[PDB]
Design an enzyme around this catalytic site. Structure first.
Site, PDB file in Angstrom:
ATOM      1  N   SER A   1       0.084  10.954   7.140  1.00  0.00           N
ATOM      2  CA  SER A   1       0.949  10.569   7.832  1.00  0.00           C
ATOM      3  C   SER A   1       2.256  11.239   7.448  1.00  0.00           C
ATOM      4  CB  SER A   1       1.270   8.947   7.188  1.00  0.00           C
ATOM      5  OG  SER A   1       2.013   8.983   6.106  1.00  0.00           O
ATOM      6  N   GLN A   2       2.429  12.347   6.684  1.00  0.00           N
ATOM      7  CA  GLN A   2       3.666  12.760   6.701  1.00  0.00           C
ATOM      8  C   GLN A   2       3.585  13.981   7.953  1.00  0.00           C
ATOM      9  OE1 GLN A   2       0.991  13.905   5.100  1.00  0.00           O
ATOM     10  NE2 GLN A   2       0.748  16.245   5.531  1.00  0.00           N
TER      11      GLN A   2
ATOM     12  N   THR B   1     -10.269   8.156   4.669  1.00  0.00           N
ATOM     13  CA  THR B   1     -10.596   6.640   4.412  1.00  0.00           C
ATOM     14  C   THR B   1      -9.844   6.187   3.051  1.00  0.00           C
ATOM     15  OG1 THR B   1     -12.046   5.238   3.502  1.00  0.00           O
ATOM     16  CG2 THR B   1     -12.627   7.869   3.228  1.00  0.00           C
TER      17      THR B   1
ATOM     18  N   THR C   1       0.814   6.297   3.575  1.00  0.00           N
ATOM     19  CA  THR C   1       1.719   5.531   3.229  1.00  0.00           C
ATOM     20  C   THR C   1       3.144   6.065   3.445  1.00  0.00           C
ATOM     21  OG1 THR C   1       1.930   6.362   1.045  1.00  0.00           O
ATOM     22  CG2 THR C   1       0.741   4.321   1.188  1.00  0.00           C
TER      23      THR C   1
END
Lengths: 308, 307, 308, 307
Positions: free
Chosen positions: D39-40, D12, D70
């Site tokens: 996200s990597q 979150t 990001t």
């Protein structure tokens, strides 16, 4: 080939142009006229009006216009034309940051790309354009960003419309605010614009500059404010007073990018002020003038500032 | 732990030691309210008391953090940069978001400002401004956007360092002389010479200029177009002012780059001074200080080339 | 006048140079030699070494060096020289984004400003420099920022050192990390550098590129990671393994500005990784190579990455 | 109020309706965790389920907000930009600061993302990314700095709009065709063609390239130097790959600007495709999608000129 009219306003940025940059005749049939001859730091209402009237008058006898202009006030004239031109054809402005005799002078290639842009069928309907450093920029957002760099012109808030590579343009954007033939501003029967001056804000700022304009009966004042359009104690009191006696005031900002927003820092509705959005002070002046030939109502001037 | 004094000039940008408790892990903090105003109202008085205060309390603390509004931050920073005589770090900080908004930026800015002030390495780099994880010098820093938390940048020469986890990677330090190397001392002053700014644009009126010359202003700074150029009318008015004693600096409304000497205008012939990379508001600060020292344009130029 | 040696590595960026840009002989006595002739996209270890050895060898027979070079890998060669040159004199690199025959070609004025910079007593002791678009930039921070703009080179993290106007330079900064004669790297007796390759990270990235280099026995791998130096599942496992068997790995990032910081996203100390700080992947490769001629210890390679 | 669905892909970024209560003043929010990873580690699987989900639930809601890391945000955004068939707004948002750090950015980002998704005006502008008060299109947006809250920018063409007080000033909209105007449909796919990326630099090895050609990759994207140029070795290897069926796109490691056609390399002679302004990671996304449609370089180029 397309017929392109070059309208010159000052000295030549290259070296007729066609002899100085002979590649021009491979993309267009060029013809040029000197409508005036001055440094752009001396640009004024007269020149603007004759420029607009000309473009509108000769609109049908050519396919496109390239306007040669000094860089100093380029962004001002560009926006004015963006709001007053009624021609469907492309109107492109171009200049040079280096004297045409200096080595690595930028004028010649700028002029070439400007003609390329004007002759491109795809450039039509995107409003008045400024071509510099291989880039197509809209008249509203473009501004001068550095005092001497060839790459000084950028559309600092929303970006350029396209990039030129080898005489081809990759357009990926077009302006959303209404321009040229979609505006209600018509200056074809005007011989003067309302008077609008600009005052700067800084620490300990004097109220005299503002008071001088209010006393000379200026139709509107544009404030280059600090931060998000805020004003110094004294300048505030003076402008607030002006507004309730009929002077129109726009809050803009000396900060070079971003919008001066409505009712955030200053209660615009209570004082009768108008916020300029992303229009910097010199550009806000151009719009305020044009609005003033139409209305004196601040509530309405704000609407105008939200549409154009 | 280092003792750091926080000098407040406006409202609180956070919520201090109770609002951001992490502070007492890096410093012994103490604060005073020297004044309370929005920075859009910043003025000569405030500047002078700020400078006199820092110079006076310099020895009873290891570093200063000054809380200030962002609107004129860049102006005050440069003034302090030129008048503080303290060896210690003097750091300015603010917030672009109200302390009550979600994702408010004041707390971490304040934190990193204290970190910066407590760093031995920050000494001798002149007055600093810490915003958005960056250490910026008072001379080059300027407000770049009206609302972005990342608005402050040193647009011509870049920042001094970046902060990551309370460590600072300094890779630069200002070359122009500042703080204790300047000849400006305001400790015995109660007022600065009067310097106003005028803007240039198409069809600009000369009235604003004429108003200041008529009120006997000591200097005028011209926010010119392009490389410091001026509109016909404003030119004639300023040229006249200059040969009767008024000092005039050519600066520019263009946000980056230097306004250069004798390029566009013959500065020597009219007695003008070019501001270099100082924007108009910053040029006003230096002209004020120069004027407490000299009225000679040839010398004011030298000053503009050194500080 | 000062004696300035021009060292050419590829094609000419102007038009000897002295005949193509005759203004050169008003600021210096110029002489040029072609040390090699290749496009910079083919730059390699050999060329670097002979460049460094030359500059160091001819250091005393001239007052300054201008090195003509392609833009493609310019930022790479500049940093290498920044760490290996032992000459006190100025070493300045320059190039052109436009072919010397195109109109408004940038080479001539760039070359001129490069010579001006090299002949300036004030340019000494600021490390290897790159002069482009009227700007003096240090070899460490400078990078290529746009694929075609004349203004592409910028020192994206810390800014330029100075700006040139009319042959005068206003220096207001100098690099703080140690360079040239303050580094322990000496290549004068070297005929090859350690092998260091670069792998890219993106969604669903393959581990094959990394495994190919580990299998060929590469001395170090530089990872262009995502975000603040992070890596994809597979690439991670492969590099982590490499490191504990002697391969040296630097975490850098494909993000063009900012530092890849220590122990933030990845526990560097646990895996034996080194974070590159603000060095982008190609620049991190140059340093890692040079460190490797000195030590294989990751703890120490990190110290090096914190000092140069 | 509009119904907005929040699709979560990781941790979150805030603290949701309880963590940022202001949310229920602009929308009726509901959320689901479709996956949970950093996200990597983003991959083909995740992309496909995201797209299929949005397309499937399109009619039971007014807009989507996708919470995402990001690191690869810009990649996922472009993929969705090309495969979503929903008329409704699909907005992606993240945070550069952990939700527990002071001055955390997630809360206000989330807020403005919901605002954006609920705005009638946001429809038809393709997949959007909202960060730091800005609305950015999925195609041009990219990560610009490793740690700055302001890191996301549309570096070639600029943002679509700015948010101030829950109002959006839209002044731009993407021209390249996206979402429902593309021919790419992955609703019946379980895997995408294999596309890898190789980097170019001085003395670059050809091994990385050769590894992918040997594993039978469908395409290789080359992060070239300058205007898409390649190192001697990598060139010879890719040129050979191309004439045996492997598709190769020339992109660039240079963060802004287009890699242009037939300028530096004779693309027609070798069968290469130039990526235009698509950076390497974004070029990989489009090549993958193109390859589900064609293996013809002449046509892949057309695709790169249209989307």
């Amino acid at each position: 080939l397309p017929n392109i009219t070059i309208l010159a306003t000052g000295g030549t940025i290259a070296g007729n142009l066609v002899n100085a940059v002979p590649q021009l005749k491979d993309i267009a049939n060029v013809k040029g006229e000197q409508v005036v001859n001055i440094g752009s730091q001396d640009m004024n209402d007269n020149v603007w009006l004759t420029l607009a009237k000309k473009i509108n008058t000769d609109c049908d006898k050519t396919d496109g216009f390239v306007i040669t202009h000094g860089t100093e006030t380029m962004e001002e004239t560009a926006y004015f034309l963006d709001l007053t031109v009624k021609c469907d054809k492309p109107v492109v402005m171009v200049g040079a940051m280096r004297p045409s005799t200096s080595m690595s002078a930028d004028g010649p290639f700028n002029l070439y790309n400007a003609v390329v842009t004007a002759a491109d069928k795809a450039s039509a309907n995107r409003g008045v354009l400024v071509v510099m450093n291989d880039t197509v920029l809209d008249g509203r957002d473009v501004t001068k960003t550095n005092t001497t760099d060839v790459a000084t012109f950028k559309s600092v808030n929303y970006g350029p419309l396209g990039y030129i590579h080898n005489g081809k343009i990759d357009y990926q954007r077009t302006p959303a605010r209404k321009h040229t033939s979609d505006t209600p501003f018509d200056v074809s029967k005007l011989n003067e614009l309302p008077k609008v001056g600009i005052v700067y804000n800084y620490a300990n700022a004097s109220d005299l500059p503002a008071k001088a304009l209010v006393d000379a009966g200026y139709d509107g004042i544009v404030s280059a404010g600090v931060g998000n359009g805020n004003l110094y104690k004294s300048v505030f009191d003076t402008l607030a007073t002006a507004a309730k006696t009929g002077t129109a005031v726009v809050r803009s900002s000396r900060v070079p990018t971003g919008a001066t927003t409505q009712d955030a820092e200053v209660d615009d509705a209570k004082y009768g002020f108008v916020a300029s959005g992303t229009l910097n002070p010199q550009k806000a002046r151009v719009l305020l003038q044009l609005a003033l030939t139409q209305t004196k109502d601040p509530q309405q001037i704000q609407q105008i500032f939200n549409q154009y």
